[model samples]
Target: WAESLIGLHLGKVALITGGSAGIGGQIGRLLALSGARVMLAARDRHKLEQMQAMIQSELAEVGYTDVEDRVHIAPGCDVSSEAQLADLVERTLSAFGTVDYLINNAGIAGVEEMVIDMPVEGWRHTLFANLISNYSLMRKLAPLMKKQGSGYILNVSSYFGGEKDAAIPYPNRADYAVSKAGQRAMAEVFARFLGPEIQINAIAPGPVEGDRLILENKRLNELHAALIAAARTDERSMHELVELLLPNDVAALEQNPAAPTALRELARRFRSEGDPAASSSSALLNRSIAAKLLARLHNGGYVLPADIFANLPNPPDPFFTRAQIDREARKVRDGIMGMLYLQRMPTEFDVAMATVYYLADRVVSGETFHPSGGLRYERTPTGGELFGLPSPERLAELVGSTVYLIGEHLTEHLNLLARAYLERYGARQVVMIVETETGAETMRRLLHDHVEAGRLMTIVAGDQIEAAIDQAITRYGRPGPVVCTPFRPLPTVPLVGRKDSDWSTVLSEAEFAELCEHQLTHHFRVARWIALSDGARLALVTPETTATSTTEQFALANFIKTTLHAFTATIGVESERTAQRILINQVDLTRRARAEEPRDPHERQQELERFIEAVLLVTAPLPPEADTRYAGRIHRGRAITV
Candidate 1:
């Protein structure tokens, strides 16, 4: 279909900006094979030369001897710069004499820093590369296309970019998401501005596996390998408190004494628990969870995956290993592009085909396309209603108070957050509300000691949501702060394409309740049991809201998360305690990627620290933004807020 639709374009010239490697390379090669002369522009001169030659080499094998004449390269052209962009157009036009196609596909993830520490200029630079360049090029090239009477432009955006079709910003890479989003907006703006003579559209693809993805994995691996080495060599523990628990003498090593055996008993409690959370990801801003892990490693009881991997002879980069697995196996493990309905990562071929379709199919002008394996196509969530928030001082007063936990997803992250609530807040007891037996079992396996001491309570929805609420009210009295963190993310396919049994194997009853029960049923039923008395505080942890009627699980899940925010506010107009909402998109979404990804382990580890801190501060009724100050970030936008 793609070939017949876009036959041999013997005289056309296509200019691909931003990347020579990644998706652009694929687009460039296909355009050349279809007989269009291709001009590849990129910041790296050497990579451009290699891609140019490689495309030529591929064409040569296909008997296209004129391949060298069909492709040209614009090395060292950083389109982010107005001057560089001008030079790029000049060079392309000079080489081809006319440009028929403009592909804006370049962008960068700027320096790693939270919004607070984000350098103003650095952020602008990324927008220029990812967003501005597309605008500038369209401004520069549209006229030429108009005079020529026909033109096509394709923009390569990302699923991380805007909430239009629904998107979540990446932590520490806010600019990248924002810029990609801007480009999509630009596509619409330019599409309208260009009129009948030009076709401009956009494609948002999920993370594409490429040389850039591989290098990033290796870079993180190299950094983590060094940290592993340091941890292995250090004889002393990083924390003095944890050190007291270890048997520390050379004689002790030889005797292998009974050693109090308290550690074993502790693990036997059906479980585990722990410290204030520190990590190697950011030292100045956090404590050493790494030290705490070393303590566990010494105990020879509960340990981490890293603890096991650390002792291996010449440890390898975990991220690199995941990336190296052949496409077939990695696709099964999923991500870098898992959860995409297609069951595979988007390749340059997929994107190039999409791009070619826009160029060839005159019927597709001004439309935004998603080659995202069906993970991100529904676009109804234009905006949402936010009802209430409390003053900072009022919020600060709620800290260190007892609370109830409710949610069916992001188990690991919620587990860490719950630990911080217990260890850091010193709560009397915790109550859990899971609507399914599976969730109850999973939650039980997670927080053990709390269950033993009678401080933690797990409530399965069984036949009664009120019964659990009644039990909780009986134990702790009317709860002051009720936290509802229902896990719901967009599925690869929408509801119509799914079945109850299809989900039965993967979802717990509680989880299915979120899907099967009418929208907001779980939230209302659970909230029904919580005391609606005056001054009762309600907090909802949610993924950023999006258009509701898209995927069955996702739309319902989002409603489960956001509608309560609306619910709390409705109750709040008369009370001191209003329902406050905290978005966990940046804090918790990465865990899905990290768990399913091969991109970077240490990268995820660092973000995990970010996630833990984001939760600690907000739940403490303090600004999670405080974390930026510790890292000495200048602006004060915490990824999550109280």
Candidate 2:
């Protein structure tokens, strides 16, 4: 039923945001292929054109000759600006005749710094792009869709929507959720008010497998996994992403390290067209030579459309497990212009079969051997066959060791790298204790992306960890090592709310602690190594009346000490963004602790001095890490506990 709807109505009337690449691009491609005339709107003109070219080429290759017209246009426009969007709509209508489907798929990631440290500018900009712009798009596009009488509006959102256990809620966002929440609310309202005339739905996709973030950060792969386990989300059509990388990224390995050789040196090799010359000493060298020969063939009118990899029967094995292959290929492909033969799979029978066949076929009869770049071809000594064999051992034996990570502030890259080591060396388990939702996301992404996929057992300190480990123990028959990342709250206010209020009644103390522990443990174990920073330095001081007479001063002193204790034990460095020299807050600090103290000029002056020092200290940047041995210290408070 759904397929039928898509087939009949989708053609020649769809619009997408950020459609130049990634998920947005994929969506546009699908919509176009499904017989809808698709329009791509994005900010990058170069990328949009590339996406358009790719879409057209792919359709032709797949023999979609009949509906090639279905994919019609790409327009460069910023969705955040109503003016640009207006222009986009005008141009799109001019070309396609009408608009049918509107998709708001554009969004950016968290700002460079975490929330507390993130600037107001960053907060505003990110919010504007991710949320406000989305709102604008809908506000403008709604009228057009209403005129059509029936249209589908899809809003792409995030997994954090359902999360509420966060201590520092909305850790990386100030505007995304607010806007999306508003957008979702608006959609619900529209659906209710406009009923049956227009249909609007929102898809809160967790993460796209093999997306940009996944490629750049392995932790993202883990994040995707965590989302799957937590939300029961399905992995979409992502296998094709792997194949897509092979053709685009792997074939760039044709950068030869050989320099240019004169044409006269090549004439001696071919005395006649019939005679073939003796092979070279190095297989790597020969491959370079063969690559240059192919380039010559292409340059000399031997092949039209100068892409040799396209003419090859099929692409070579992608060499996916090795980062070096991808890195080297990128370096060679973009840095030079020529044929590249970097792989070495020489057989015992015949090593130069590929190169020889090309020469004999008259593909290229010119070009002398010369190396480019600094590619070295050295022979390693090996009397025994290097193919496949096991040497006899005096006594086959193996043993393993485990390391534990305790505390939140999870280090993501370290976790995956450690997992790689432990699995390689036969280590069994890793345990991490965590404290926050941010920490949880880090660990979740790590375990799901690499460790779990590799069949390695990792125990988190949370309830989820226990469940996962229970399953692992049942399946593997043995448990692994434990790494703990313990959660600890920073020195701050403890609420003294009503005896049975909403916030106070939310969860049991033990349950909260368990969740905190889980977050910490998850953060630490998920990463291989955690980075360290100095503890905080605070100089808290309650007012004279509060400190001199009331119980508030004593309570504040105890709270500071307790916070200090937690800080020392956790082993976390203060983030530079969070490590302002004068970490001071006045909201709860300067307010009266008791009803007696006169609220007049004396009180105001005291508060002003206390806060000015704080403002001055905090705004000043630290000189140098090496120059400072001082730490953040809290002075004192009226009461430490409730």
Candidate 3:
């Protein structure tokens, strides 16, 4: 099964950084096996030679000794040397007429210690190894690929990069985290430009089971085997009973012994035996596999539900006194808020924490998780370890920094100063309207009650909403920040639970048209960005779509496309009802607006299940700064369903 699921190989033209050992080695083996011309780059020439031989040996064993034609082994290209990287790129291109893929997988795992204890050399080494090396590779390789206008750039990262949770502590792993964050942002940059042509994506895996780091921790191995044995006997009850057995409530399976081993075994079985009976969501697997298989199920075996992670060790605030921890948390929160008010970007930790919480609520609330087979949550021997609703103080402190980062529009914009990030994607300022009483009151309430200004919307009178939104962009729209463009068209015409007859689609269209007209008259008038549904009668979008097109694209079409591009877009296709059987909504986590309803019950059920599944996936938050503390900022908030 794994052999079949293996990725497509671009036929003898790929360069991988840190492509010699561990995950890098494994990836190289897989890529070479899959028919890519593989090139390995790292500091270890000895390791590279060994890996190259091993790959060739594996191919020979597989009765494909002839596969050597598709493989190329290069040694002595240090990732840290920009000169070496550039020269290597040239040599590779010269050897092979063109290059197709660049895999930035080489990275160093630093020693874990407090921020004070971490050596400057260690930080530099990690940064150079993890961040700059990949940057140099991409910077050198991108122009070559850019010439072709089609390729794939894959970046490797860690779970710590996406969200700071229990892994390497910040002080100990600051370099690692910073490097990963850079890689993550770099991936996005690539996607923004090379998109639809060059597929760019990154994977920030949690503790990979067989990774050298996990194997070194003997305690982790012992725990993993035990956890897997427990899970195998009973999957459903494991979530509840995990805390009683594990040392830390919020600790990852990789931190314990049983997780990674169990995960490896599961993968082996899944690939070898096609044992559909086995639950793939074992905690032993890294974050990617957990996300793909475990997170979709109701079984909480692999990922600790947010609530469970929060309350683990039977109330996790034992490390710091409530007062002291709260003070620190509040300080972090204030820093984030201040940054936002000033329209500046919050720190990396702040953003990661916030994003994790936002995503967690969606998953645990049973709003995003789903499974393909009959499995629900994974079972455990004793189901008493898991529970929901950790106390407010714990939840608040854990997510405060992160929440502040996302909610503060001003800070996010400020963060984008050098990058001019928002300009690449057609985003302006978030639209805020101030209506007199009816409309104005609604806008005021939205801002007051919730709605992060940067990411949220404010509805005012149609004209006022447009004017204010325009002004916000003119004065506040930072180039580097990701844009949040909320179109102020008419009002929130409540679509949820409304009958078809009661819904006046025509009135909505007219208002949207007016909004688009305003955007054209005031802002980018020559831009074209619209794609419409099969049925043109009832559609959706913002007013910013009036622009240029490859051909003579419809004015209305471009307007709709602009809105979709700004927000998230999934095409909604309905069943018998005039609406769509499919539902596509914005990627914005906070948007609670109802999409066109599906006529099919099964599809609706599946959609709801997926939502819930996503909520259940995120359980760990970033660890505390010190080793002496039991950190609880590892879990996300609970999900809510209407």
Candidate 4:
């Protein structure tokens, strides 16, 4: 189980811009709570004071009774300006001797306007406020961090941007999207450029359900006022003395009928937006969406440690009517994140947990974390979810797919059960490869039903191993996966004491080469042939005996045990374009034959059944959307620790 530790960052220093409120303010509290000295920066002084008051207010019972010294503020440092950014850095160094973490969360979303109609200057302003602002600060602080030989930069990007293939197509927010995407792109560059001592990563969260400007009608005006002032600056530089105007504010300039020629043309372009209804859908949608989003999430933008929906009695001090709660809950269930695996939005509190993880963690450099509930991957159940158990529906994802099984050590019972189990796991066809004709003959008769249905194919590999693989691919169509299980031979004597007859029978030099080297080569050709078609998978099922000896007392017999373990390392590279996995099968049940306490018939049958069950699941298809992240390495019945 996962645990969140505290007192882990007792003396770290964090400089978090935009920390006056929302995610910024929320992260500041967590940093200070975990023993990091925090400096809150924002354009508003009252909000900074408010954030300090709240942190002190909320952290009281946690032994941080006197958190005053740990919480500091840089009152009006708007990072969009380099002068203010430089001032904030000096202010931070003055407050805390050196910075350990630099968090960039101070950014603005420009006024709602279509990108095509948006003036070139309007686009410029958004980038300066959002993307360019963060770059300037990172440039300013990263070197100081490098000199110190340690640091982390967390860019608070958004789901609207910073996705591999899932960035949202948000109309009228093109500049904002571009700015966030650039943050991730820059984080990648900085991660490599900063080398090993420094770390940089972007955390992209979905529409934070509790953003104050959207939830509180009172603050909408404050945001609108800022946008209005920013607009005036851009227009003043380019001159927006409008001839076309609504009967609002300075729209009285419409009275000047014979205005400047350029003004008239600019006015003409502005009118086209309203006249032809270019923005009708988005405007109405945007307006009502803002109105609709007024309902704040129970834990969303607010910071309470528990899910309030479950324990309604002692809710956070903020009062809410039933209408507001129901509306927001319904929107969460049916509206915004319906496609999410969890179908819920992540709160500022949720994001705080991730930041704490990254800060406390010493490894992990360039990874982008998604605190966005299951937004990174789509909602599809996986066959690999239960290790050896696959739900019927999930197993059915492999309905018409094929699999290739390559190895030795199969008895008559195993070959028969393999047919039944593969059918259950939904492998429509199977191609099995063995080194001898007798092995092939045994499987052909044993898999008679599979053979009758034309679902079973075999290859007797001698010199035509490559030809066998291509023939399988060409005849059965490409396989979704290839399962490779090498020979597991037990020797009769130790190498030094062994006679020539003993070597020839169980542990010969030629046998060792055939078992280890040739099997590795066979697997490579199989993987190379299948991986040319993307998404195919290779599962190198190394028996537990191959990793650690189950019965061997002789060191000579230990040779291939570790050799097979090492064999797992490189095929992942060979199959780089496709996917690779290893299921280290539990120690062969038969290896327990001469043990002091032997399992009886029923117990042995049960154990063997479990082994076959695990094998079927590994060779089955993965959920179409599952990330091969955990799938790339060895799994011994359960996922190995990351």
Task: Provide TM-scores for the models.
Answer: 0.46, 0.34, 0.36, 0.42
lDDT of 2 by residue, 1-642 (tens): 124223443343778887887667876766665556778888888888888888777666655674446555556587656577678777777878657667676777644332223333454455455555654555445556556565555555543221111111122332343334333433433343333434554544332332411222222222222222222233322222111212322112122112112111122222221112211101111222223333323321233233433423221332122553355556644433232234332221121121111112212111111111112211111111112211212001112433233334425323643454355444444443344466656775766644455433334444343344334334444222223222432222221222223333322333322332232222322211111111212222222333233343333322222222221112122222222222221111322235534367797565444433332232122234422433432211111211
In Å, residue 247's CA in model 4 sits off its true spot by: 13
The regions of model 4 sitting more than 4 angstroms off are: 1-5, 165-168, 212-333, 376-642
Cα deviation in Å at residue 216, candidate 2?
15
True lDDT of residue 497, candidate 1: 10
**Using lDDT as the measure, which candidate wins?**
4
What are the lDDT figures for the candidates, one per model?
0.52, 0.37, 0.39, 0.53
Q: Order the candidates by TM-score, highest first — what do you get?
A: 1, 4, 3, 2
TM-score for model 1?
0.46
Clashes of each: 7, 64, 86, 0
Q: For candidate 4, what is the lDDT?
A: 0.53
lDDT of 2: 0.37
List the candidate numbers ranked by lDDT, top first.
Answer: 4, 1, 3, 2
lDDT per residue (tens digit) for residues 141-175 in model 4:
66567667788888888765534322333444555
Strongest candidate by TM-score: 1
